[PDB]
Amino acid sequence: IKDGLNACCYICIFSFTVNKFEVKCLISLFYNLVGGLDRNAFRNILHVTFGMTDDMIMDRVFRGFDKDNDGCVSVSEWVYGLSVFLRGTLEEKMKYCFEVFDLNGDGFISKEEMVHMLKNSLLKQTLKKMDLSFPDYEAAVREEALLLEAFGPCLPDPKSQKEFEAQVFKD
Amino acid sequence: DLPSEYWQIQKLVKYLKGGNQTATVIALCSMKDFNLAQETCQLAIRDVGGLEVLINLLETDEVKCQIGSLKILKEISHNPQIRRNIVDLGGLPIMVNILDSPHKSLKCLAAETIANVAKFRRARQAVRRHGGITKLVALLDCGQTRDVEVARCGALALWSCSKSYANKEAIRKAGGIPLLARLLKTSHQDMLIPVVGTLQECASEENYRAAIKAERIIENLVKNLNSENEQLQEHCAM
């Protein structure tokens, strides 16, 4: 295939938790989206398809997928993060959520990425068991699965994501 | 005065019932952090509505809603006032269809809740009328270790529900006797206490005695009269 060679090389390089035809059609819909994805692609598709109306989290998940900071997000990291969202391990989820919810990227979870997103979490009118470091953060997250996304939303919400993967991964 | 827990749980309910994913996740984080077994905390959550907002989050598509919600409902359902206002608000029929809703955490933690709810007649008859007896019986059938914990919760729920003749008739019509026989054959002790706890007062009935004798459950009780946890020989002797 003139475009499936990308997916073949990507299963050769990256160990996606999705299998052959799944990643073929995933990259096919990526190429449908690009007509390779910029900012506006994220701010539209993760708002309409996914949800999570917090625009700071939109930019933050954009940069977390854009860990290489090329602006035009590459298909390699795009499909890698999408495979993470589809089928990811607990360690992969905690690594991704930690480095994303660290907004400035200081390697930890300081005041500007605890209190600001706590008030993002509070519709205006935790560290007791964690402490912020990744080891004890991981300890309290594997204790309470509520704590996995206790700084930002992320999603993998089943009724959202299993329906979306139902239209994506058309057999 | 109303407790500090009442004040925070009021704020958390306030940004629970009309919030979003992050709001719900951290509000239920603080819910889980608060002392659930405290009776004053149970009354505070009841007075702020609380529980019923958690059934509204069961309706909401997010799933950590359901996980934290039903865990907290189990741990605060130690007392009768909580559960009678559960059925008065109407969240319990909904929780009955959570006993079939696709995620396992839903069914297991909800069956723990009704397991510690169903001391009196109303919860038992609600679960039977809205079908949760038969769906927990299917979870005990295990046609799909995940089945082991969901069946342990369903079995402890049926043990709480094993005083109503209509509930017993529902189990008998659904055919729970051979599948409880196979779960009695299985050596997981955590299932072995409440399965026999259910089967005891279910097998007070004569057709149940005929069924357990047709399936040779007496031999299984003889095999299980010497387990590590002590309570199994009490229940088998019953």
Side-chain angles (χ1 to χ4, degrees):
Chain A
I1 304 98
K2 63 183 74 66
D3 201 3
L5 58 92
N6 192 181
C8 293
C9 293
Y10 275 2
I11 73 165
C12 285
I13 297 178
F14 315 103
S15 70
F16 301 126
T17 50
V18 292
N19 60 18
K20 194 91 69 176
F21 175 71
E22 277 165 48
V23 67
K24 296 292 184 291
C25 73
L26 199 154
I27 302 172
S28 87
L29 188 153
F30 158 80
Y31 272 97
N32 292 339
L33 289 181
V34 298
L37 294 170
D38 71 314
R39 284 141 291 298
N40 197 7
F42 270 73
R43 284 86 170 94
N44 198 13
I45 194 66
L46 282 72
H47 182 215
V48 175
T49 292
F50 279 163
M52 65 182 179
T53 66
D54 189 358
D55 286 328
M56 197 291 291
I57 298 298
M58 291 325 198
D59 181 67
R60 190 61 257 170
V61 174
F62 173 75
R63 288 173 39 85
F65 277 177
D66 198 8
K67 61 179 78 68
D68 56 1
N69 304 113
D70 54 6
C72 182
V73 167
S74 84
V75 64
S76 43
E77 59 188 359
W78 166 261
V79 182
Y80 182 76
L82 276 192
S83 167
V84 161
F85 279 172
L86 267 292
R87 275 70 174 174
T89 65
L90 182 62
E91 293 285 329
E92 173 38 61
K93 286 168 195 314
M94 65 183 73
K95 295 292 193 295
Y96 179 73
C97 82
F98 183 76
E99 62 86 20
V100 160
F101 298 157
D102 192 3
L103 61 92
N104 60 337
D106 59 358
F108 279 142
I109 297 172
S110 53
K111 64 92 176 179
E112 46 183 355
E113 68 272 15
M114 64 179 287
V115 177
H116 182 74
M117 293 183 286
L118 268 169
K119 86 178 179 62
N120 280 123
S121 178
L122 197 154
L123 193 144
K124 297 290 179 184
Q125 50 97 30
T126 314
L127 281 73
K128 175 254 295 178
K129 62 183 66 57
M130 293 183 286
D131 277 328
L132 174 56
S133 199
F134 182 76
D136 49 351
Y137 168 76
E138 157 181 357
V141 171
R142 76 217 183 209
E143 293 179 353
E144 290 182 354
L146 294 174
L147 276 190
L148 182 44
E149 274 76 40
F151 288 109
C154 276
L155 187 152
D157 201 12
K159 184 178 184 293
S160 294
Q161 71 169 351
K162 94 176 77 72
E163 281 294 326
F164 174 52
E165 79 195 73
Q167 294 92 23
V168 163
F169 294 99
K170 223 69 192 174
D171 291 330
Chain B
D1 54 345
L2 295 171
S4 62
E5 281 91 7
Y6 187 102
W7 310 128
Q8 291 93 24
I9 290 161
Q10 164 69 50
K11 314 182 213 167
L12 302 158
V13 160
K14 168 185 63 186
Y15 72 84
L16 262 189
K17 67 167 67 179
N20 51 1
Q21 302 261 317
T22 301
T24 297
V25 159
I26 297 169
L28 262 173
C29 280
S30 305
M31 293 297 103
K32 183 63 181 291
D33 298 333
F34 294 148
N35 189 21
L36 311 173
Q38 192 180 4
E39 202 265 340
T40 67
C41 182
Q42 309 175 3
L43 298 188
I45 296 162
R46 165 215 58 181
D47 291 323
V48 303
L51 288 78
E52 193 210 49
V53 179
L54 303 183
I55 296 90
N56 305 140
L57 299 151
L58 299 171
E59 304 169 354
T60 315
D61 298 333
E62 208 275 334
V63 177
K64 295 183 184 181
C65 296
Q66 312 156 349
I67 306 175
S69 165
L70 300 168
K71 165 75 171 65
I72 287 153
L73 294 203
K74 167 204 55 186
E75 199 75 9
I76 77 183
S77 67
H78 304 339
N79 302 327
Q81 296 182 358
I82 294 300
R83 58 226 190 198
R84 55 201 281 111
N85 63 65
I86 276 172
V87 191
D88 286 330
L89 293 153
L92 204 80
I94 298 169
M95 293 177 70
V96 169
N97 64 64
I98 293 89
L99 301 169
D100 202 79
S101 290
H103 187 194
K104 40 167 284 187
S105 79
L106 284 153
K107 321 166 90 170
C108 81
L109 295 158
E112 277 166 346
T113 306
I114 296 89
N116 165 227
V117 173
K119 177 266 301 173
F120 61 102
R121 314 154 290 199
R122 188 177 180 181
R124 307 178 253 148
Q125 66 184 357
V127 165
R128 178 205 69 254
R129 285 167 66 201
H130 303 143
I133 296 298
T134 63
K135 317 194 290 275
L136 289 180
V137 159
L139 292 160
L140 300 156
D141 208 340
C142 309
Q144 68 271 15
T145 62
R146 303 178 183 272
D147 62 358
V148 171
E149 72 266 12
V150 186
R152 94 171 310 280
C153 309
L156 177 62
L158 259 67
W159 191 7
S160 56
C161 286
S162 306
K163 287 186 293 296
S164 176
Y165 180 61
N167 280 96
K168 295 190 285 287
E169 196 39 78
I171 304 159
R172 210 263 298 162
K173 289 164 155 312
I177 298 89
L179 60 83
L180 294 174
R182 94 182 77 185
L183 295 175
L184 184 54
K185 280 186 189 299
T186 61
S187 72
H188 294 89
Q189 203 34 60
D190 78 0
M191 305 214 301
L192 282 176
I193 295 92
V195 166
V196 180
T198 299
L199 268 173
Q200 163 188 339
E201 301 97 39
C202 289
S204 296
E205 189 36 59
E206 285 88 21
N207 55 13
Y208 273 89
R209 314 216 286 268
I212 72 153
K213 281 187 284 291
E215 308 155 19
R216 279 88 169 269
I217 293 178
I218 302 300
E219 193 166 17
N220 290 318
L221 303 155
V222 165
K223 296 171 224 159
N224 283 291
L225 270 162
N226 52 4
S227 85
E228 175 63 36
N229 269 267
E230 66 174 358
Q231 290 82 6
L232 189 48
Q233 68 251 17
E234 283 80 349
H235 301 320
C236 295
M238 293 297 102

